[PDB]
Amino acid sequence: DAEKTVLEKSKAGAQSRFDSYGKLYDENINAGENQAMTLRASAAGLTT
Amino acid sequence: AVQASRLAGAAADLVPNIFGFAGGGSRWGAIAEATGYVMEFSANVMNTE
C-alpha cells in the first residue's frame, strides 16, 4: 500500500509537468512577443 | 525632442544669410534633410523599443 502511494504521488508530479508544458504550447506567443514583431516590421517600411 | 529640434533648425535655416551685393545663401533642401533625419532616426528608436 505504501508503494502504491509512492507511484500515484509521483504521477501527480508528471501530470503537473505535462499540463504546464501544454499550457506553454497552446499559447505559444503571448501579447508581448508579437508586439515586437509588429514593431520591428514597421521599421522596414520606411525605406521608400 | 529630436523631431522638434530638427524641425526648428530647418525652419530657422531657410532665411538668407549673406547680404549686401550678394544675396540669398539659403539652403533650399533643409526641409527635406530634416524630414530625412527624423525619419531615419525613427527606425533606430523602433529597434531600441
Side-chain angles (χ1 to χ4, degrees):
Chain A
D1 308 330
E3 183 65 26
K4 201 181 287 271
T5 290
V6 167
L7 265 63
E8 52 78 21
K9 179 255 289 181
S10 292
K11 181 174 68 68
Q15 173 82 35
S16 68
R17 179 139 35 82
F18 167 68
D19 63 358
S20 300
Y21 274 136
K23 205 192 316 299
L24 294 177
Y25 189 85
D26 291 331
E27 308 66 19
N28 55 326
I29 284 173
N30 50 9
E33 278 178 20
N34 59 359
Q35 195 51 244
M37 311 305 278
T38 61
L39 187 58
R40 194 76 63 82
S42 52
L46 312 183
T47 183
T48 175
Chain B
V2 59
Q3 152 173 352
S5 164
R6 292 292 161 88
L7 278 154
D13 189 281
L14 274 296
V15 302
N17 69 344
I18 74 172
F19 304 103
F21 292 105
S26 49
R27 190 169 79 272
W28 310 115
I31 299 286
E33 291 171 13
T35 300
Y37 291 164
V38 63
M39 189 148 56
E40 76 191 19
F41 187 95
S42 185
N44 288 274
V45 65
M46 294 182 286
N47 295 342
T48 302
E49 186 160 49

